[PDB]
Amino acid sequence: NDLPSSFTGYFKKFNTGRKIISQEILNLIELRMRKGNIQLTNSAISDALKEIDSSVLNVAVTGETGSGKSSFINTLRGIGNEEEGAAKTGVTMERHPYKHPNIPNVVFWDLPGIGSTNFPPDTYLEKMKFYEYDFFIIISATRFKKNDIDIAKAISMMKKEFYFVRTKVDSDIKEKVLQDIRLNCVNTFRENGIAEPPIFLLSNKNVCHYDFPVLMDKLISDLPIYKRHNFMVSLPNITDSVIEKKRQFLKQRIWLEGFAADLVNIIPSLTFLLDSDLETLKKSMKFYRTVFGVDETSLQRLARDWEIEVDQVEAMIKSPAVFKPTDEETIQERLSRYIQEFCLANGYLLPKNSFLKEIFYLKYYFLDMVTEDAKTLLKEICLRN
Template sequence: MCSDSDTNNAIRASGESTLKRAKKKAQQQFEHLFNVSLNIAVTGETGVGKSTFINAYRHLNDDDEGAAETGVTETTAEPTPYEHPTIPNVVLWDLPGVGTPNFKVKTYVKKIQIDRFDFFIIISSVRFKENEIMLAKEIQKRKKKFYFIRSKIDNDIDSERKRRKRKKTFNIEETLSKIRRDCQENLKELGNPPVFLISSWNLSAFDFEELVSTLNSELPEHKQYALLQSVPITSMAMLEKKVAVFKKLIWAAAIVSGGIAAAPVPGLSFACDTAIVISFFTRCYHAFGLDDRSLKKLSERVNKPELKDWKKSPLLNELRENLCKLIPCAGSVAAAAISFTMTRDLLERGLKALADEARMMLSEAGLV
């Protein structure tokens, strides 16, 4: 028999004053985790690495199935959407190169239908030029956010290292500072926006994590959930940010589960509670980089082939087998309260198990 403390725990976890309001907020938060769209526009001149960046963000190599087409000539004739392979509500758009004959700067924003995008990433592989600056001004006028990426940084580092090898004066930090200053010099009229130095071949290097942190701080909270689920894990710190997202929403999943359990329909509680728990853990599994595709990409990036054969957690299969023992099926107020408590505890234990496995995997990869 349930106690008032179970219901009170659910209300307290929500930060609301009544169970009705707690359920409403929980449903909204849970929907945000799975269904909020995030549309990222990636643009710049021809050949700067737009498609390669999109592929890297989506855990894909350029020759993988479903990858954005790459090349030294313009390969994008129209705005082309690319769904994230495991977080389908996140879409990266490969936009035609700004300033091409069919996409003049003055008509570019209208042709690409700017309102459908949450923010713009403007990429250049050299100094930012007039076209990028004019485009940024047009985006500004329409109250949209934009972020500058200086791509192919690994190539610049290699070239500078070779150039200075004889003099033995190469310093990577000085080289990066010089590249950053050169880029920012051309962007003064935009108010000195930050420039993020990125190598799409190795997102763990340079400024990718700083870019993610900046995006995360400027997006609405419900959009942050989509961003942090979808970005590649480049360090232990990045993993912990992802874990924090799921921890924050455990209460919502548990209350949604409890709300379903209160419905007097035989069998409905079990089916829905199972779906909620499994879908929550499946999102964790992919967001933490434990799926085959992510492990393969990580093993290639850190040159450790053994990571491709990382032993998978049996947690999800165990949950499918044992949920019937853990979650009540009877439709009643008692079942609702028990379902909240038990689902919350189950989600906490499962999240910890998956997070610990991901931590071990990153330690093995050397990404501490």
């Protein structure tokens, strides 16, 4: 009903595992809004966004050589295996990092298998600097080994998160050969004195297949709340679910940002646009396009994979022309029209006589645009092949 209730109510749509901020903090912020603590409410939101933005993620990936490690690391980074920057199989002396191409805050580490070293579990983890990782990805293309489990045991002893990933299920060429593959893994765990652990089976030809979806959900879910945003944004845009999930996260961030900047009591209508906010809007559009893989480069490659000049790929979507020069229409007119379109379909998102400043409604419009663009190209990429 009131503003304090509208602020926290916006997050009712998202379950515990999809919030980019905790209910505890949301409840705290609301209290401060209701207390009139007109400064502590802004600092709470401020520090919350700051903590979200500066979050760094380090993912340790271990297993055996030629069992998927490299492909896993590369598909999560959105890089082709023989592409530049592509993590290369096996190699192995010691730990090797691979930063995400777009989100510097995310780093995957190729760790040498403990089998290719003469280090016992705990000492191996100390050598590999276990304390630096947010979670571990234990990969096996078969049914895991004693090594894989001793490592897990050591990881759980230190309170860290690990996940069992069975790659190359696709090479297993009825249909439910998955339950068999899963049966072999379970016996291994049972054989090693461990209760039934979850397992995620993955495919290489069709990477976004099988347990990829739920694995993606688990990693974000188990992650500390403030770390989810930066990792979510880094995931590969290979399913409408990941894509739609990213939008949900970015929408939450815009909301927080809109409130921090202070609400206003005048309808949006962009009659004058500071060069200041224009550049901000240009940066937002560049951030969203990259995140959703619809930025210039991504479109160029896409154009090659098919043929035709980029010209026609861009023509398939809408975000590429937002800031493209035209003698027929000014940016002011274009953006001024977007605000009206948005608020006409979505309303002002707040109780009567209260509004977010103009830029925020524009960020929401762009985000929707890019999200739709990504789903359009994905649908085309899938339609083929």
